[PDB]
Curated annotation (Swiss-Prot), chains A, B, C:
GO terms for molecular function: ATP binding; CTP synthase activity; glutaminase activity; identical protein binding; metal ion binding. InterPro entries: Class_I_gatase-like, CTP_synthase, CTP_synthase_N, GATASE, GATase1_CTP_Synthase, P-loop_NTPase. Residues 291-533 form the Glutamine amidotransferase type-1 domain. The lineage of its organism: Bacteria, Pseudomonadati, Pseudomonadota, Gammaproteobacteria, Enterobacterales. Pathway: Pyrimidine metabolism; CTP biosynthesis via de novo pathway; CTP from UDP: step 2/2. It holds the Pfam family GATase. This is CTP synthase. It is an enzyme of class 6 (ligase). GO terms for biological process: 'de novo' CTP biosynthetic process; pyrimidine nucleobase biosynthetic process. The active site is at C379, H506, E508. L-glutamine binds at G352, L380, G381, M382, Q383, E403, R461. CDD domains: CTPS_N (cd03113), GATase1_CTP_Synthase (cd01746).
Amino acid sequence: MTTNYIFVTGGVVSSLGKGIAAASLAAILEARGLNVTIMKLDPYINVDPGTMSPIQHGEVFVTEDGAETDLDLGHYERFIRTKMSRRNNFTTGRIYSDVLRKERRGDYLGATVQVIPHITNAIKERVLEGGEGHDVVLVEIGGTVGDIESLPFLEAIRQMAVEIGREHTLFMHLTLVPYMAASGEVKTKPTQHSVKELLSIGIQPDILICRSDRAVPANERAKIALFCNVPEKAVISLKDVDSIYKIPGLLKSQGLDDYICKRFSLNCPEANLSEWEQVIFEEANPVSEVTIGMVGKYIELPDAYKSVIEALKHGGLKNRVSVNIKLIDSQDVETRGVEILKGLDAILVPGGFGYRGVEGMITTARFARENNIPYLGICLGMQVALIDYARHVANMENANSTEFVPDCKYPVVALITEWRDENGNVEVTMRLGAQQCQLVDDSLVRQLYNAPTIVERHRHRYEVNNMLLKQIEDAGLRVAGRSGDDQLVEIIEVPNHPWFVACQFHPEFTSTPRDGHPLFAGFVKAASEFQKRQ
Amino acid sequence: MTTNYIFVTGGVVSSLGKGIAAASLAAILEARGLNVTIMKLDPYINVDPGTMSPIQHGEVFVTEDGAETDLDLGHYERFIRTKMSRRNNFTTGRIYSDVLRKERRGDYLGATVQVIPHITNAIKERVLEGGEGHDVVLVEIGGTVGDIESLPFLEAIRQMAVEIGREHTLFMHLTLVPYMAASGEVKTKPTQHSVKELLSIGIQPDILICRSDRAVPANERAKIALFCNVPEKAVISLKDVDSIYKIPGLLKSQGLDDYICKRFSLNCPEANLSEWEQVIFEEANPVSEVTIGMVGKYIELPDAYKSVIEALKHGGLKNRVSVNIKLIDSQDVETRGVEILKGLDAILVPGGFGYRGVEGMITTARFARENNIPYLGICLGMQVALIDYARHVANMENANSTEFVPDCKYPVVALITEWRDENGNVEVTMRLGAQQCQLVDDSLVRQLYNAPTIVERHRHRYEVNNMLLKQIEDAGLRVAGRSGDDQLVEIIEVPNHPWFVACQFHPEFTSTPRDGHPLFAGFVKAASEFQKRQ
Amino acid sequence: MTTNYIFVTGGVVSSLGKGIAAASLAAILEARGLNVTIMKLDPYINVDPGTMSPIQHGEVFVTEDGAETDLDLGHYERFIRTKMSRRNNFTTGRIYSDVLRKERRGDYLGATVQVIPHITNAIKERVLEGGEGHDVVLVEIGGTVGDIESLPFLEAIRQMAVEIGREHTLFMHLTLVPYMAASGEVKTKPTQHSVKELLSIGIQPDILICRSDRAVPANERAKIALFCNVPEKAVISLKDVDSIYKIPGLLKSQGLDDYICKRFSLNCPEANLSEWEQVIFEEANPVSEVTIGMVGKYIELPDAYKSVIEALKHGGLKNRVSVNIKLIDSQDVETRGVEILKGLDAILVPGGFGYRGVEGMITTARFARENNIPYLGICLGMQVALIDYARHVANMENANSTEFVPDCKYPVVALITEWRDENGNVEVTMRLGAQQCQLVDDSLVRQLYNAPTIVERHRHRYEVNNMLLKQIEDAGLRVAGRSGDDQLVEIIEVPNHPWFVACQFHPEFTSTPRDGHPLFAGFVKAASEFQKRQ
Ligand SMILES: Nc1ccn([C@@H]2O[C@H](COP(=O)(O)OP(=O)(O)OP(=O)(O)O)[C@@H](O)[C@@H]2F)c(=O)n1
Ligand SMILES: Nc1ccn([C@@H]2O[C@H](COP(=O)(O)OP(=O)(O)OP(=O)(O)O)[C@@H](O)[C@@H]2F)c(=O)n1
Ligand SMILES: Nc1ccn([C@@H]2O[C@H](COP(=O)(O)OP(=O)(O)OP(=O)(O)O)[C@@H](O)[C@@H]2F)c(=O)n1
Ligand code: NA
Ligand code: NA
Ligand code: NA
């Protein structure tokens, strides 16, 4: 059958939760047995988020194929089982970069290269490339309708709708319906003006998703329908929910998936949301409560640790525990000491780059190791764990990473090419995406993962220095996992500790609310067990 | 069968010939056996054009039922055989007048009366009133898309399309496609911008009629289709033709009627445009040529005499005479004398109000009478013919109308209530629309109309003074027609003349290019006869 | 000195509190010694709100000259000491009514009457009429920028700005800046889009007043300035304050009046807001608390009783009583009985029309009288108080108003022309605006107003029947006030009661927060006295 496209646009404001809304709709369609994918079109000129600061954009999501993408693809993978790739995320920058390259080498045969049709054609090609061979493709258009940055995307999808036909294309538009205290009424005017803006660029929306702090009553939905040339049943209320896992249910209860399947002439069974009903239940009914400190350098923006914060919450779902995440500035541990780590049932040190706040994270890994507080180190969290141990147990004074102190005596962490020992002797690449890791037979990790070989995702350059490893191993530290021919250290553990695991890979990118994650399941359990020994 | 609506809008500029294009489309649909009507929605505040001077938006057209309307209804009646009434023309003024009246007396029951829905409801009610009981209703929206004055009409028809459904409603949009000499190319940008403007108001055009001084090539039509979400075959070219009677053929040859009948699911035969082909043939194959002088006070805007000019052309068709119409200012006859009436094969004095330029018309009527030049007087053209004959034959010094000189000794023209004689002795209201007129047995008009009674349309309050008539009759003037129990003089003749006729009514409003008009056929024949004699 | 105009527009949503913001700005300019006025341009088709039910856009405000106006004029009179008249409020309906009347009788001399210039000219003439002879005129444009209904007003004021010049005209634009919980950020996008919409109509705002549930931070204000061609200091924040009396101070503290006086070249002293500081102080420092029950038929929209609710708050200010207003449906008293009138320190029955809920108010007046609960009746609240006393004390079975029961034996309230007695014997028009009322020597109101004559504002046609009055007077009811040569009953009192007063007029329309109102000051004092006694 012909591939169907749902173009999802945002009006009035950004921060409507358009990613989660699109992911939720994809979840309902997947729950119908449909082959569904989602792609994010980002209006930024960055060729990809690889260069971007976590504090500004939020976390860099890493796909299996090793693409650095918008954190929204994390939302997508946590709602549908289709694996994201490079084909599921592209930016204005990628499109202009491609068109400029083709132009400079002469692929347009001396033609004038214009936003229309050359930029729009490049956009359409990447949308077809990522979509074709699926039943339904959700295409999330970043930016707000009315802004300059999204116009080429909006013109591209307008052209696609006409070419492919309106039997296989829907326009879905999210708007804000603000509630005013003074009048006690919700306002449809912003939605009306947003739809006019969308029409002015040549797009008639087929479905309106109205975001408000409460449900949009029938009267206001009827007003929106009348003013926006949209049938009443295609005006969906999506209130501020206490849990995003409810959103698939709320959309189904309003017939959104029925309307879509009718429009695309899909005969498929009723959506089975039983896994989501289970997730909703687990989250609403925690038996215990835990305070887990996340000690890092990007806590200025929580979205910097989006997938880590979500992976913890998923650990809470599997153990029926309410995880209170305390975001602690690692630089505050340097200034004010381990005083601010007191009253934590567990400690997590997530990913990061740069020396700023790293000495605070080293101190944190020590305090966790010495006081038997459950610890999970991710990438940089493993680096500071190996440094702490080598520095304070194996007695390798000032042991550090070459990333932070290039010419230190004991570079316990360094690039493969920088690998040297304490005397400066030597022997004789960025790691991105899914890599097979070999677990050790007696390790806490091999128990939790319940398998010999795991696949987790890397985004790191600096590796555990194999030339200084044996000296750290003999001082008590255990290597729980390794990968490849170079036998690179993937996971370390501290025996004589209730729960101490640090890994190079980013386990948070494979964690889902439905299937959870072994490491975070274990980690939150250990946090619970620790909390009821006080 | 549900009534189908075609909403005709104009963009870029006014003066696109939107009325003639709508009329021409109606003529194709009429030629398919469809029950078709047209209505004009005028954005002006005047309750009707009754108060408006003809130097503004042109002549005041009068319908059978006595409605004063836009001259566009003249175009409608000349292209389809459906008779126009008050239901076929209304203004913003009419809508506001009706809604304000209803509001003031309390019909809206304490509701806030708003443009939406109260003004838009009133507009839709009048469109449904004028339209329902027809197969296809063409609704011409006056003004230009993007202007404030038309927005209530556009919002009204947007709501109609949604309510009635898109199976029974089409949006047809006329645009300008200018030719630029500099690039020798035709420009689609105005059409693109006009369609965006129409979309921003919530209307997707289904058909684009592109007006240019030449045919719009296939590539530019394909470009318009691409940018305007309109199928390529729904992009119609309409060049500036030498004859408006060719337009129905040009629209048919591009499949406009085929597209409309498909969208509306109408099983009707192919259009037989034989009647229009015949008119085109007649017009292109004249045998002789005449110059007819039209002497009036509104010549500065020819559309002041739209129906009269067209009626003269129809007379030409019926005699195979090419009519050269010379518009002559009656005020120039007051200054420069009868010198400017030389080289005329016939003289027409059309309708008008106010004394300005009337003495020039009286002189013109005298000149036509004394030099045996064929003369047709319409309304004022009859008044000045009666005045001429009263002064210069019946020897009534300064004989005039009370409209111009209230207290003259010989008010040969006056209101029925003002009727007096030369000594001021008396006997013991506006006429609008179709009135029966009794024709006199041995009269020129009796043999032209070939019937004892005729129906013609009036717009005048100033009648022939019956108290001074008997004196003018004895002096040689023949009453050729009377009407009503008041035996009001409708037609006069000077029988010592080849062709001298003047009527109170506006015969030009019943003249069509297909069926012609007896009076004008005779006038142009007399002009041809006069031309031959020189 | 040339009169200066500040055009106040709203974008994004209605219910921005635009009237109170304009009034507050007027109050700052008043406190600088400037001769300031405000006018409201309402986009509704109603010629005036006289026909409108109070459940629509709220209470019908009445001016001294007897004009029925938008309740915004209530806000204006409560913030400046300039008296509002018919010149301070007009609707689209009024403009169209005037232009249609002029057009129909022929004032436009055969011209085509268009929205531009004829409607826009009529609007500008009324703005100049209401404004000229003042230093600064605030012109509040009703509706929201982007809507059809306001476009004639916006085009009118655009033309005014150009004609008068930008040395004497400012555009002030109110927008919503929503807070999003998801991102914990404030959103400028709606303001950006609203300013673009205003610019697309040809208006560059000079000042932006940003409405949010909190202060708009400096960075977001700088962003708004950047995108909207507006200086940073002309971007004013206005949070949702706990008291509207603080708004003048907040606008002054951001230099709004300084910017306005600079742009208009006005040498006037710094604003002394001592009167507003005093009101704020009074409001924030109550000594006691009372619950006053307001029993009416319009409680579903509180703004139906805007001026009454405000008048009760002003009474509270003058007694340092915090007034808890309980809105009670009079229909609930008809069903559930006087049970719901328990725990009330005083009862107010405000104005209204129609029989619906009146029997509940009669019961309420009885309950207040018999249980010695302080009672204020306004217009209908007086009618039901007279009816109560006629039935239950003067023993007149089913005594009523002719408005509700036309043919009752005892029409104690009726039109002057309907006045009859119990046996149907007779004696041998709308009251609007300020009328003098004579107060009786030994009356409660005579001592509250401390004057023999008072000026109060009327809106009623149904008077006290003087033919049945003498019977009710003998039964104990005291006439406290009369007016005119017809000695119509204006105020009644039950003198066997701590505080029972009811007036025909609307005292709430002359009550201000600064100068209070004698009647309401007394009512709230009586409520305080009653509260203490329990
Ligand atoms: N294109 C449009 C749309 C609307 N209007 C007008 O709008 C006014 C209602 O004024 P409102 O502030 O209450 O706006 P509303 O439509 O109710 O939406 P909201 O309140 O839920 O935000 C009403 O006279 C009219 F419909 C308009 O003029 N042109
Ligand atoms: N919404 C739009 C539409 C078009 N464009 C651009 O427009 C440029 C061609 O500029 P042109 O003056 O030649 O305009 P064109 O479209 O050929 O119509 P025409 O009047 O010439 O017949 C071309 O780089 C690109 F298509 C645009 O930016 N945004
Ligand atoms: N005419 C405009 C204005 C802006 N843009 C773009 O807008 C994007 C930021 O998108 P945002 O949702 O964050 O909007 P922002 O401007 O911050 O206001 P706010 O509501 O968040 O307070 C940013 O890449 C770029 F500025 C645009 O394309 N064309
Ligand atoms: Na509203
Ligand atoms: Na071109
Ligand atoms: Na932002």
